[PDB]
Amino acid sequence: SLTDSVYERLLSERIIFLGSEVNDEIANRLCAQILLLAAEDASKDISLYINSPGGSISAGMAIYDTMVLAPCDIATYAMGMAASMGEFLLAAGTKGKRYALPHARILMHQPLIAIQAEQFAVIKKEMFRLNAEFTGQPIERIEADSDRDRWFTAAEALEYGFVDHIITRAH
Amino acid sequence: SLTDSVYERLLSERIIFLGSEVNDEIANRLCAQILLLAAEDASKDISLYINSPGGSISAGMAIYDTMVLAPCDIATYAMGMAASMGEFLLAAGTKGKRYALPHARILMHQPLIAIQAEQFAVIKKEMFRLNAEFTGQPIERIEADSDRDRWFTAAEALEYGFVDHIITRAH
Amino acid sequence: SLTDSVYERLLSERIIFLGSEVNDEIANRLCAQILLLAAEDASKDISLYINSPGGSISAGMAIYDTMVLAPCDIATYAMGMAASMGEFLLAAGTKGKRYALPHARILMHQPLIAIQAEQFAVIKKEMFRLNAEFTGQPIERIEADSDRDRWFTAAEALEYGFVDHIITRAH
Amino acid sequence: SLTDSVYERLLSERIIFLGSEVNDEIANRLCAQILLLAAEDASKDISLYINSPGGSISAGMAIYDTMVLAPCDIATYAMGMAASMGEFLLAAGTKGKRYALPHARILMHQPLIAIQAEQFAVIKKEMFRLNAEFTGQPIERIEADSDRDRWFTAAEALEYGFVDHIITRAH
Amino acid sequence: SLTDSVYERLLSERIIFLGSEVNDEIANRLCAQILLLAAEDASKDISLYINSPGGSISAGMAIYDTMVLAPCDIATYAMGMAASMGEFLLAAGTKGKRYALPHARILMHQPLIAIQAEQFAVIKKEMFRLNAEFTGQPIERIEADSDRDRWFTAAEALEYGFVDHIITRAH
Amino acid sequence: SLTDSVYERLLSERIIFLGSEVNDEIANRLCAQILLLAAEDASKDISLYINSPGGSISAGMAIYDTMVLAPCDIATYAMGMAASMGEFLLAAGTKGKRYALPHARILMHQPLIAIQAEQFAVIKKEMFRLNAEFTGQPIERIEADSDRDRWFTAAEALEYGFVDHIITRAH
Amino acid sequence: SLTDSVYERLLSERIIFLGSEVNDEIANRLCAQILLLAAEDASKDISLYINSPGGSISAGMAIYDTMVLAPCDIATYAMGMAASMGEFLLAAGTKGKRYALPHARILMHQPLIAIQAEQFAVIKKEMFRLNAEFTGQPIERIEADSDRDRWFTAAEALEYGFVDHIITRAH
Amino acid sequence: SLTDSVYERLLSERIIFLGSEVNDEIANRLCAQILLLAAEDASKDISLYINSPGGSISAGMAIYDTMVLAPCDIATYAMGMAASMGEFLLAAGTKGKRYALPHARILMHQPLIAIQAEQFAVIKKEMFRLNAEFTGQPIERIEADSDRDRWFTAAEALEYGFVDHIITRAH
Amino acid sequence: SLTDSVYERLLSERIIFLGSEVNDEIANRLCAQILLLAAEDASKDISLYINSPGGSISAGMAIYDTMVLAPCDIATYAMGMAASMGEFLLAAGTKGKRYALPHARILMHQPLIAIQAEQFAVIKKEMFRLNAEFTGQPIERIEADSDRDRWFTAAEALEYGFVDHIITRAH
Amino acid sequence: SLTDSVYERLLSERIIFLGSEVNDEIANRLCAQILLLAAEDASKDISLYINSPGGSISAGMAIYDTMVLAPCDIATYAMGMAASMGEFLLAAGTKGKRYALPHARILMHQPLIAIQAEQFAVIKKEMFRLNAEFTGQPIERIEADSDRDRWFTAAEALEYGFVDHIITRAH
Amino acid sequence: SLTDSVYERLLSERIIFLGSEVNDEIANRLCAQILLLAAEDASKDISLYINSPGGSISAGMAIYDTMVLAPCDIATYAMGMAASMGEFLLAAGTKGKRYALPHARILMHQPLIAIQAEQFAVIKKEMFRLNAEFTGQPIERIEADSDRDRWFTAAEALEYGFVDHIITRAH
Structure with a gap:
């Protein structure tokens, strides 16, 4: 399934969810969704509903890149909570089309061997930017x-x- | 599935259930359902049946926001029990279209680090309001x-x- | 599924089962079923087959309410065992259309903090009534x-x- | 599923199996099947194939009742083993249409607090009868x-x- | 399922993912996908999206071979991370049609009895080539x-x- | 499942995989596939893609016999690795239609109570032959x-x- | 263990606990303890502390028999709760040496195939006696x-x- | 065990811990300890260290009763947290010998079928008293x-x- | 056990370890150890070796209180890592007897419903103090x-x- | 246990083992052992037998520090393998008393967010030193x-x- | 445990077992035993009973070194099976004191990145030697x-x- 069935139907409506922790697996799936939708129709908007505690930077960054890639606008909706990378993706929606529901709330958060440090430093700075x-x-x-x-x-x-x-109200 | 199959069919009738604890997962799923239904037809009503012990405020608050967002009326039915956030959502139905079944009963209930207190105080006050x-x-x-x-x-x-x-009787 | 497949097909025949413990989850599902059926056709009967050790009063009472709510008759069948709330629901079928299978058997049973006692007392009295x-x-x-x-x-x-x-025999 | 797919297809041929221990769950499922088939067409025969070690009396008695209830004939086939309640159900087929396959074999078997004793005595006597x-x-x-x-x-x-x-041979 | 459903739909758009460790199992599945796509239409492009830490050389080499085998172009997209064999496969896309998303990053990495050493030496040299x-x-x-x-x-x-x-942007 | 969905679709293209250890289970499944395809159309070729470490002789010998049994040609492709019985099955393709992909590699390997020894000796000699x-x-x-x-x-x-x-290239 | 170490030490003081559900296992262990203590010294008292919801009649009855068997007095202490068989055993202490702690409370309770009924009836009547x-x-x-x-x-x-x-106070 | 070893040694120093939730099991074990110590020497003090969130009233009341029963003084020390029944037991120490460590803190808390309500009401009133x-x-x-x-x-x-x-400082 | 045997022997040498996460359970055990040692001899020193990532404030604060309580000096040794509460306890040792091993390192760290907020604010401030x-x-x-x-x-x-x-060197 | 019993007995002979991966847990345990032995007799030698693949630097460094701390000599024996930190600890034994068994072999190995990098760099440099x-x-x-x-x-x-x-030979 | 109890007692008789796979863990344990026994009495023999399929070379080589190290003779007994490193260790006993039980049998067996190959070659050659x-x-x-x-x-x-x-016979 019922849950899946609903999300599937909703995907036929160009409506998409980030409803949990932003990890690689979910990231991939969201990216997949954005790509599919863009491929199906490059002109119609995509709606992304965010209620997420955020998660891995690079994972989130992958989503962002895919949003940017997709030729069509991506509308963003803070529904419940947009924290860390969830905030970032909220903020990253096409300007003009970023929304918060009245009781939604946004949390900023300082996110998350020698080689991994360099990479992280570079990508953290880039996120702040x-x-x-x-x-x-x-x-x-x-x-x-x-x-x-x-x-x-x-x-x-x-x-x-x-x-x-x-x-x-919507419309 | 049988259970899912029934709820799915019922969703095609614009009929929806809050049948347990209001947590983030279930909230997400309900919001998803309301969104789908609104997207499918913005003019027809949505029926929400409530038999729930309530649960998390912000989770319930997300649902409420989505109800408000949806252009169409949301008919509310207390079927069994509407407690805490379950009561709130019952109460939040479109005025004129809020129902209780004869043996339904409604429970009000005082609901549920430094940063999370702030947030909670703000949202608790907002619920009472x-x-x-x-x-x-x-x-x-x-x-x-x-x-x-x-x-x-x-x-x-x-x-x-x-x-x-x-x-x-119905009709 | 096979089990689910059978119950689904049987649901298309306006036939429904209460085949275990009456808890909230099952209650919700049965109510869902009655609602769907009533929505599909408000004039045709619904057949409810009971082989159930009963269970939670308020859960059972929710089912009862929904039976009453549904415009159409609800035929009731004691198949095997109708105990506690299972007996109640058997008894609650449309008068004239309450059946027992020859070897079915019916069990009456005295069923099942300060705030919960009040509620229980009220609902137990109401059941007896x-x-x-x-x-x-x-x-x-x-x-x-x-x-x-x-x-x-x-x-x-x-x-x-x-x-x-x-x-x-049937017919 | 394959297993389920086969039984499903076989159910479209009004062919049904009791292929294990007669417990409540299986009983419910068989009763379900008998009801579905009778509802689909009250005049055509149902074929019940038995290869079962038997099991709970009341569970078996529920199946019997449903056999009786179904307007249509129920042809019975001992395929492998019909023991205890499996024997009973074999014997309970429509007279004229009870079959044994050549190497099938039938086992009779004396089957299976104060209140449960009463009930059992009553139903045991009734089975013997x-x-x-x-x-x-x-x-x-x-x-x-x-x-x-x-x-x-x-x-x-x-x-x-x-x-x-x-x-x-069949025909 | 949802994840599978998305990737399946996306496969109907000639879009394909390398989204984890390149092991034999995944390799087989990608090769399978490339083969299917080529068989369905030998003239349209295939899009391969890469977010992979790489993995086994020979596994990756099998994918490479299948890419070369498929008559159609294979467009390559670094989405997130292309490391080791992931990098290799990114690099192996049809020249002109190799892409990197803005925050993608590429990692080169020195990869991974007597008989197995020979084979490895031969295939490592070949990869470098x-x-x-x-x-x-x-x-x-x-x-x-x-x-x-x-x-x-x-x-x-x-x-x-x-x-x-x-x-x-895409287009 | 996505993986299964791909192999299924690919099966409609008369394309088949030996993509892991040759054990009885997988052997049965491949034989099943070969038989199905042969039954669907006895004249069109079957393409068998091999990336397998080999496995049990008799299991492999079963596959072989089924290949021989199938009236149609069986094209064989070494994709990655064909070792032991994987090599054998590669080699057992219809003469003229045995392929290796450029980086595929073939491994020969001496394979794998008193009664089982006899059987093994007989079947090992037969494999060498x-x-x-x-x-x-x-x-x-x-x-x-x-x-x-x-x-x-x-x-x-x-x-x-x-x-x-x-x-x-293919064609 | 510490828990066991405490009870062991306490057993050296002829002090014994019924601290949970009276089932066969616990019964056995208490009888064991009573026997050991009696064997160690048949003249000194045994102290039995009761904080138990009671349990199986026959299990309780075995403990009683052992109490009677032991030549020495058995002092009984209601500490917290003595219910069902827990009450019985409290009451069964040597007359003159039955104690309740001030907030202790005693619950009487109607306790707990054809052959087992007989046995239970006999033993239930005997307990009441x-x-x-x-x-x-x-x-x-x-x-x-x-x-x-x-x-x-x-x-x-x-x-x-x-x-x-x-x-x-004690002494 | 080490942990058990430490508490055991400490028990030889007439030092005792209430270091978690006051449930029946722990209550029993504490009572056991108090009884053992009292039996070992009825004149020397017992030291009870409390760092507990409290718990079940009747469980706690049993401990209290045993404290009163023990002829010797019971010194009480709030170490960390004494809440609900933990506070009660702290307060219940021999007057003069009740201590709090400087950063200890005390929480009062309104604590925790028809038959159980009566019992609870009686025991809650008694606790307040x-x-x-x-x-x-x-x-x-x-x-x-x-x-x-x-x-x-x-x-x-x-x-x-x-x-x-x-x-x-101590001394 | 060996591990426990070692720590036990070491406890007889008035030597004690904080060697993991400061949670309530470990806190209790340390406090238990300090009490035991103080009770055994109030004049001799206690040695506390710290290699801990710290943990819960109130847990750590309990330990501190116990250190202060114990009449004897408590020598403190940073062996490896003293972080958060681990650092605090290191710093809380008897002045003059606080040690760091040459490669030990110290980490300060901002540590860790409305009612719990108050308590935490009070205890956080108190820690800083x-x-x-x-x-x-x-x-x-x-x-x-x-x-x-x-x-x-x-x-x-x-x-x-x-x-x-x-x-x-020591001495 | 036997294994533990042997190591314990061996500990009474001032003989100690580093016999696996150097992680925090094992480090703690070795440090504990060294401290114990030092405390038992500050003048007699300790023998440390090394057959370890090494492990965490800081863990190893903790052990080193404790060796240095211990007033007594620490004799070191390479028995099998001393790699990474295993090598380091072998080399760190009291000069004159560092041994290798004839077939022992020594492996040097370049060992193993922004904040952890700093720490690691400092401790790596220090290790080399x-x-x-x-x-x-x-x-x-x-x-x-x-x-x-x-x-x-x-x-x-x-x-x-x-x-x-x-x-x-030894002696 | 009994098993450990037996081996322990047997260890007091200078009797020792290699009774399974020669891995690092077991090797460490045997070396430990040999060291213990040698430390306890450097003049009396040690008996090592071998019933082992062998295992890792270097693990076995460590045991060998320890045997050589121990001043006392090591008598060797093939009991059941000595294979690979089990054979080696059997053979490595003090000359004159190497025994096979009548049905024991001995198996020689060719045993078991670039860096590990060097090491292996060196140690394999050394074993053969x-x-x-x-x-x-x-x-x-x-x-x-x-x-x-x-x-x-x-x-x-x-x-x-x-x-x-x-x-x-022995003696």
Whole structure:
């Protein structure tokens, strides 16, 4: 299945979910979904509903790249919680089409051998950069706010720049 | 499956169930269902049957937001038990279209680190506010009644304002 | 599945089973089934076959409410065993259309914090009331017989008023 | 599934199996099958193939009842082994249409708190009664034979009256 | 299932994934997919999306062989990570049609009784040979870079010759 | 399942895989496949792709017999590895239609109570006999080479006679 | 173990515990303990501390028999709860040496094929007889009180005759 | 075990721990320990160290009774946390010999079918009574404070009367 | 056990280990050990060896209280790693007797419903206070350093004031 | 256990084993053992037998520190294999008392977020430093040899300076 | 345990077992035993009973070294089976004191990245060398016989030189 059946049907409506931890497996599946939808029709929007505690940076970054890749707009909806990479993906939706539901809330969070450190440093810096860009804020503030684990109300999130609209009714 | 097959068929009739603990997983699934139904036909009603001990506030709050988001009316039915967030969602149905079955009963219930407290306080207050609004009562009474774990008969529930009608036959 | 496949096909025949413990999960599923059937065709009968040790009162009461709610008649069949809430639901079938199979047997049984006691007391009294009404007996006898865990043969069950017919052949 | 796929297809041919221990779960499933078939067409025969060590009396008695209930004839085939309640169900087929395959063999067997004793005594006596009736023998012999765990060859089973024909070829 | 359902649909779009460890099992499955696609239509492109830590040489070499075998072009996309054999397969795509997503990264890596050593030496030398050819670089540099576990940015990967384009939007 | 879905579709293309250890279970399944295909169309070729470490002789010999049994040609492709019975089955393809992919490699290998010894000796000798026949070599060399665990390059395998062609492109 | 070490030490002080459900295993172990203690010294008292929900009659009855068997006195202490057979054993202590701790409470309870019924009837009647004898009450009241699940306060228990003293301090 | 070894040795020093949830099993074990120690020497003190979230009332009440029963003083030490029944037992120590460690904290907490309700009501009232007595406060305050889940600092706990001393150094 | 046998023997040498995660269970056991040792001899030192990632504040605070309680000196040794509460306990040793082994390293770390928030805020502040006190630094730096997850070398730890000596040889 | 019993007895002979992977758990246990023995007698030698693949640097470094701490000599025996940290600890024995058994062999091996990198770099450099010092070689050679995974024969190990003697007989 | 208890007692009789696969863990344990016994008394013999399929070379080589190390004689007994390294160790006993039991049998067997190959070659050659020496045979024959997996009877083993005596009675 029922759960799968629902998500499948919903995928025929160009509607897509990030509903848990952003790990490689889920990432791949989301990317797969975005690609499928783009391939089916490159002009119609995709709707991505986010209620996710976030997760692995690179995993999330893969999703972002695929969003960017897809020729069509990706609308973003904070439904419940968008934290860490979940916030990032929320913020990364096509400008104009980023939404928060009234009681949604956004959490910024400082995320997650010698070789793995280099890679992580490079990709963390790159995330901050983009979050700043998505959001309209200075990289300094994006960092400071992530260290202090700052959270946001739908209203507060609209002001900071994570999101373009708070929706009550749809249409 | 049989169980899933039944719920699936029932979903084709715009009929939906909250039949257990309101956790994130179930919340996600319900929101998904409401979204699907709204997408399939934005004008026809959705029927939500509630027999639930309630659960997580924010999970329930996500569902509420989705109900509000959906352009179409959401008819609500207390079938068995609507407690905590189960009561809230019952109460949140489109005014005029909130029902209790004769032996249904409604339970109000005071629900459920430093950063999570803040968040909870904000969302708890916000629930009381909406419960008060749905219900026609003062916020003071909504609180007092939740502390004393007050329960209601279908008749009592109609009087307090959780529900618009007690149904015997349908049509 | 095979099992599920059979019950599904049988559901297309407006035939339904209560074949185990009456818990919330199963209750929900049966209610779901009755609702679907009523929605598909409000005029044709529904056949409910009972072979159940009973279970939770409020779960059972939810099923009852849904039976009452459904516009169409609900024919009831004691097949094997109808005990506690299983007896109740047998008894609650549309008068005239309550059956026992020759070797079926019916068991009455006294069923199953401060706040929960109140609710229980209210709903237990209410069950006794309805069992009395279904059955044509005085509430006093309904209680006394439940305490002594009185059981009944198909013949004895027909006399006491649980059932309207003992079937041999169908048609 | 393959196994299920085969039984399903076979069910479309009004052919049914009792191929293991007669417990409540299997009983329910067979009863389900008999009801479905009878509902699909009340006039065509049902073929029940028995290769079962028997099992719970009341479970078996439920199946019997359902056999009786179904308007249509139920042809019975001892294929391999019909013991205890498996023998009973074999013997309970429509007279004229009870078969044993040449190497099939039939086993009679004395089967399987204060309140459960009463019930069992009543149903045990009732099984003996019916076995005697199905079989043309005195209740005394049915009992004595069950105590001594008497078994039968297809030839001996035809003589005793469990079965009307020994089949070699079909048609 | 959902995951399988997505990949299946996506296979109908001639889109294919290397999304984990290159072992024999996965290798077989990819080869299978390439073969199927080629058989279905020998003229349309195949898109292979790579997010893989690489794995077994000979497993990867089998995939490579199947890529070469398939008459149609195989477009290659580094999505996330292409390491060891993952890099190799990325590099092995039809020249002109090798892509890296902006935050993809490529890792070269020195990969993985007497009889098995021979085979390994032969196949390792052969891999280096082909990597050098795909990549435009001298075998000496391919080796040296693999020993020092050199990694690459999408930009650096385009320069070194793993990939022909860095994509932002699709079309 | 995606994996199964692919193999199924591929089976509709008369394409078949030996992609792991040759044990009884897999042997049965391949034979099943060969029989199905032969039954569906006795004139069209079957393509068998081999990437297998080999396994049980008799299991492999069963597959062989089924290949021989099938009226249609069986094209054989060494894709990755054909060892032991994997080699044998590669070699046992219809003469003219035995292929190796460029990096495929072939391994000969001396394979695997009193009663079982007899059987094994008989079937081992018989395998050597047929391998010699498939391959154009003397039985003596087939034995000697199997003892020394001799392996072969696609080129070397073509020379020794395991295979008729090395394919680069298909058509 | 520590737990076992404590009970062992305590056993050297002729102190013994019925601290859970009276099943056969526990019964055996208590009987074992009583026998050991009696064997070690037939003149010194044994102290039995009871905090048990009771359990199987025959298991309880075995413990009783052993108590009677042991030449020495058995002092009995209701510590927490003595219910069903737990009450019985409390009551069965040497007269004069039956104690309740101030907040201890005593619960009487109507306890727990054809052949097992006989046995149970016999042993149930026998328990009522002894309970009446231990307790000074009529068999009629022992029965009536067990049906109504009557419970007792330490004070009420002393009055009814389950116990000779309520202890505050020891010595 | 080491852990058990430590507690055992410590038990030889008349030192005892309530270091987790107060359930029946642990209660039994503590009572056992108190009894053993009292039996070993009725004049020397027992030291009971409390770091417990509390638990079942009747379980805790059994421990209390045993404390009172033991002729010797029971010194009580709040080490970490004394909540619910953990607080009760802390408070229940021999007056003069009740201690809190400087960072210990005390939590009052409103604790935890028809027959069970009666029992609970009686025992809950009795607990409040004794808490009031141990503590020097009115029953009204003991109740009100329990409902509001009031907690205490070692200093605040000394003032309210749970404890006679706050210890820094021992001796 | 051997492991336990070693720690036991070592306990007879007044030597004690914090060798893993500071959770309630381990905390209890350490406190138990410190109490035992103090009880055995109040004048001789206790040696506490720390190689722990730290853990729960209140757990660690219990240990601290017990250290303070014990009349005797507690010598502290950073052996490997002292982080979070592990660092605190290292710092909490008797002044003059705090040691780091040359390659030991110290990690400060910002540690770990509405009611639990209060308690945590109170105990967090209290930790910072004492850490500052132990260490000779301003509360402001203790906080700042904890947020930035500052770590220390044995040399650096001696400067900051966690420790009095770096030992090479003992005596 | 036997295994433990042997190691215990052997511990009474001041003989100790590093017989597997150097992880924190084992490190702790060895450090414990060294401390115990040192505490038992500060003047007698300790014998440490090494047959270990090495493991975690810091774990190993902890052991090293404890060796140095222990006032008494630590004799070291390469028995089988001393690799990575195993080699290090072999080399770290008291000079004069470092032994290799004739077929023992020594392996040097380049061993094993932003914050952990710093720590690792500092401790790796420190390891090289001490290995160089233990061994009489230049830090440059210690590094170069570790990268090339250089192994040594007992004879070669004596020459390089890991070890002072190769023993044949003891005494 | 009993098993361990037996081996322990037997260890006090200077009797030791190699009774399974020679892996590192067991090797460590045997070496430990040999060291213990030698330490306890350097003059008395040690008896090693072998019934082992052999195992890892280096593991076996470690045991050998320890045997040589121990000042005392090591008597060797083939009891059941000595294969591979089990044979080696049998052969490595003190000359004069190597025994086979009458039905014991001895199996020679060719035993068991770039870096590991070197090590293996060196240690394999070294084993052959010593086997030749123990056994009085040419290295050529030791190799040839190991390749052909030659096995020996107690009589044949005595002749070849693995063993000095075949024992019937002891003394």
